[PDB]
Amino acid sequence: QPIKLLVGLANPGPEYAKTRHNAGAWVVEELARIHNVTLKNEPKFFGLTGRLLINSQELRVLIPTTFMNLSGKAIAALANFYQIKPEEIMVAHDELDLPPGVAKFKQGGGHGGHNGLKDTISKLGNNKEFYRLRLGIGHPGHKDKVAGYVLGKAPAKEQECLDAAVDESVRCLEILMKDGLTKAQNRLHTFKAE
């Protein structure tokens, strides 16, 4: 299984913690919670880091403390220090083109206007071929409203769906480490929060 680093994108601070644009960090926080990992503030990697052993494999984890649009600064710093190539990184993030309650694994693709993904591609040497954990957040009707949408808080029923999709995503990451990507991706891709 190809993943050595899991990144959860977010904006820093308590104010953003429950905004849609922090969905990727929710995943890393819950994986770390379940595995008794205390993330450590490491200014050298511009984020919160940790390392966890699952099925005899070390997974490193990162939540940047950069602005979202400078997320690649943290990811490249850490990845280069540990000799981790982009193809070995999975970046969990909010996904406009999937609904609340769904998540998917994918390798590659565009940034979809996501500022964090856009920076990550750039700082990794214009390499799109890192993996993604796409956490559906829905989208508004018009382009110009996306920013205000992703920096908002989901209403309660949506947040329930989000939280369930995070739980499942954590379960499927553990499956990815135990059993590989095809099994984990098969499960996640037929999940829909109840």
Coordinates of C-alpha atoms in Angstrom, one line a residue:
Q1 CA 0.0 0.0 0.0
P2 CA 1.5 3.3 -1.2
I3 CA 0.8 5.8 1.5
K4 CA 3.5 7.1 3.8
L5 CA 2.0 10.6 4.7
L6 CA -1.5 11.6 5.3
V7 CA -2.2 15.3 5.3
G8 CA -5.4 17.0 6.5
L9 CA -5.9 20.4 5.0
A10 CA -7.4 23.2 7.1
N11 CA -7.1 26.9 8.1
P12 CA -5.4 27.4 11.4
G13 CA -7.2 28.5 14.7
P14 CA -10.4 27.7 16.7
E15 CA -12.5 29.9 14.4
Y16 CA -12.2 27.6 11.4
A17 CA -12.2 24.3 13.1
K18 CA -15.9 23.7 12.1
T19 CA -15.9 25.2 8.7
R20 CA -16.3 23.0 5.7
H21 CA -12.8 23.9 4.4
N22 CA -11.3 22.1 7.4
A23 CA -12.8 18.8 6.6
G24 CA -9.5 17.1 5.8
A25 CA -8.1 18.0 9.2
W26 CA -11.2 16.4 10.8
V27 CA -10.1 13.1 9.4
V28 CA -6.5 13.3 10.6
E29 CA -7.7 14.5 14.1
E30 CA -10.0 11.4 14.5
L31 CA -7.4 9.0 13.1
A32 CA -4.9 10.4 15.6
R33 CA -7.5 10.3 18.5
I34 CA -8.3 6.6 17.9
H35 CA -4.5 5.7 17.7
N36 CA -3.5 7.7 20.8
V37 CA -1.3 10.1 18.8
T38 CA -0.6 13.6 20.2
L39 CA 0.2 15.9 17.4
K40 CA 3.1 18.1 18.0
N41 CA 3.5 21.6 16.8
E42 CA 6.6 21.6 14.6
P43 CA 7.4 25.1 13.2
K44 CA 10.0 23.5 11.0
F45 CA 7.2 21.7 9.0
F46 CA 4.7 24.6 9.4
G47 CA 2.2 22.4 11.0
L48 CA 1.1 19.8 13.5
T49 CA 2.7 16.4 13.0
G50 CA 2.7 12.9 14.3
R51 CA 3.5 9.3 13.4
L52 CA 1.4 6.2 14.0
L53 CA 2.0 2.5 13.5
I54 CA -0.7 0.5 11.9
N55 CA -0.1 -3.1 10.8
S56 CA 3.6 -2.6 11.2
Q57 CA 3.6 0.4 8.9
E58 CA 4.5 3.9 10.0
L59 CA 2.1 6.5 8.8
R60 CA 3.1 10.1 9.2
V61 CA 0.4 12.7 9.7
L62 CA 0.3 16.4 9.1
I63 CA -2.1 19.3 9.6
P64 CA -0.6 22.5 8.3
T65 CA -0.8 25.6 10.3
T66 CA -0.2 27.7 7.2
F67 CA -2.8 29.8 5.4
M68 CA -4.8 27.2 3.4
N69 CA -3.3 28.7 0.2
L70 CA 0.2 28.0 1.5
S71 CA -0.5 24.4 2.5
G72 CA 2.3 23.1 0.1
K73 CA 4.9 24.8 2.2
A74 CA 4.2 22.4 5.0
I75 CA 3.6 19.3 2.9
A76 CA 6.8 19.8 0.8
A77 CA 8.9 20.6 3.9
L78 CA 7.9 17.4 5.7
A79 CA 7.8 15.2 2.5
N80 CA 11.4 16.3 1.5
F81 CA 12.8 15.8 5.0
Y82 CA 11.5 12.2 5.1
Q83 CA 12.1 11.4 1.4
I84 CA 8.5 10.9 0.7
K85 CA 7.5 11.3 -3.0
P86 CA 4.2 12.9 -4.0
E87 CA 2.9 9.5 -5.1
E88 CA 3.2 8.4 -1.4
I89 CA 1.1 11.3 0.0
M90 CA -2.6 11.3 0.6
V91 CA -4.2 14.7 1.1
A92 CA -7.6 14.7 2.8
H93 CA -9.7 17.7 1.8
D94 CA -13.2 19.2 1.4
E95 CA -14.7 18.2 -2.0
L96 CA -17.2 20.5 -3.6
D97 CA -18.3 18.0 -6.2
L98 CA -19.5 15.3 -3.8
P99 CA -22.4 15.7 -1.4
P100 CA -22.2 15.7 2.4
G101 CA -22.0 12.1 3.6
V102 CA -19.9 10.7 0.9
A103 CA -16.1 10.3 0.5
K104 CA -13.8 8.9 -2.1
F105 CA -10.1 8.0 -2.6
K106 CA -8.5 9.1 -5.8
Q107 CA -5.0 9.5 -7.3
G108 CA -4.4 12.7 -9.2
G109 CA -6.8 15.2 -10.8
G110 CA -7.1 19.0 -10.8
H111 CA -7.3 21.2 -7.8
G112 CA -11.0 22.1 -8.6
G113 CA -10.2 25.7 -7.5
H114 CA -9.3 24.5 -4.0
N115 CA -6.6 26.8 -2.8
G116 CA -4.9 24.2 -0.7
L117 CA -4.8 21.6 -3.5
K118 CA -3.6 24.2 -5.9
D119 CA -0.6 25.1 -3.7
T120 CA 0.2 21.5 -3.0
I121 CA 0.4 20.7 -6.7
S122 CA 2.7 23.6 -7.2
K123 CA 5.0 23.0 -4.2
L124 CA 5.3 19.3 -5.0
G125 CA 6.9 20.3 -8.4
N126 CA 3.8 20.6 -10.4
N127 CA 2.9 17.0 -9.6
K128 CA -0.8 16.2 -9.4
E129 CA -0.2 12.5 -8.7
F130 CA -0.6 12.5 -5.0
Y131 CA -3.6 10.7 -3.6
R132 CA -6.7 12.4 -2.4
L133 CA -9.3 11.7 0.2
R134 CA -12.2 13.7 -1.1
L135 CA -14.7 14.5 1.7
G136 CA -17.9 15.7 0.1
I137 CA -19.2 19.1 1.3
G138 CA -21.7 19.9 -1.5
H139 CA -21.5 23.2 -3.4
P140 CA -23.5 26.4 -3.9
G141 CA -25.2 27.2 -7.1
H142 CA -22.8 29.9 -8.4
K143 CA -19.0 30.0 -8.6
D144 CA -18.7 33.4 -6.9
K145 CA -20.3 32.0 -3.7
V146 CA -17.9 29.1 -3.2
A147 CA -15.5 30.9 -1.0
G148 CA -18.2 32.0 1.4
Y149 CA -19.7 28.5 1.3
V150 CA -16.5 26.6 2.2
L151 CA -15.7 29.1 5.0
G152 CA -19.2 28.6 6.5
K153 CA -20.4 26.1 9.0
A154 CA -22.6 23.3 7.7
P155 CA -26.1 23.2 9.2
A156 CA -26.7 20.4 11.7
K157 CA -28.1 17.7 9.5
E158 CA -25.2 18.3 7.0
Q159 CA -22.7 18.2 9.8
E160 CA -24.1 14.8 10.9
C161 CA -23.4 13.5 7.4
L162 CA -20.0 15.1 7.4
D163 CA -19.1 13.6 10.7
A164 CA -20.3 10.1 9.6
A165 CA -18.2 10.4 6.4
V166 CA -15.1 11.3 8.5
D167 CA -15.7 8.3 10.8
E168 CA -16.0 6.0 7.8
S169 CA -12.9 7.6 6.1
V170 CA -10.9 6.9 9.3
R171 CA -12.1 3.3 9.2
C172 CA -11.2 3.0 5.5
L173 CA -7.7 4.4 6.1
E174 CA -7.2 1.7 8.7
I175 CA -8.4 -0.8 6.0
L176 CA -6.0 0.8 3.5
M177 CA -3.1 0.1 6.0
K178 CA -4.2 -3.5 6.9
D179 CA -5.5 -4.7 3.5
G180 CA -4.5 -2.3 0.8
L181 CA -6.0 0.3 -1.4
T182 CA -8.4 -1.6 -3.6
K183 CA -10.3 -3.0 -0.5
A184 CA -10.4 0.4 1.2
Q185 CA -11.4 2.2 -2.0
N186 CA -14.1 -0.4 -2.7
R187 CA -15.7 0.1 0.7
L188 CA -15.4 3.9 0.8
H189 CA -16.9 4.3 -2.6
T190 CA -20.2 2.6 -1.8
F191 CA -20.6 4.5 1.6
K192 CA -23.4 6.9 2.1
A193 CA -24.1 8.4 5.5
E194 CA -27.5 7.1 7.0

